[PDB]
Protein: Cytoplasmic dynein 1 heavy chain 1
Amino acid sequence: EPTYDAEFQHFLRGNEIVLSAGSTPRIQGLTVEQAEAVVRLSCLPAFKDL
Structure:
């Protein structure tokens, strides 16, 4: 199995990722909190097209 260290680091300290001013776009069917979560977690290469 790979290290999965990037995935686990994101799982633990995901909210601590500093977003750019209003870097969170609006996604249909997703509250603003969910949109922020999607924006933060899209930094992972696996979730680029999320």
Notes: Helices lie at 5-13, 32-41.
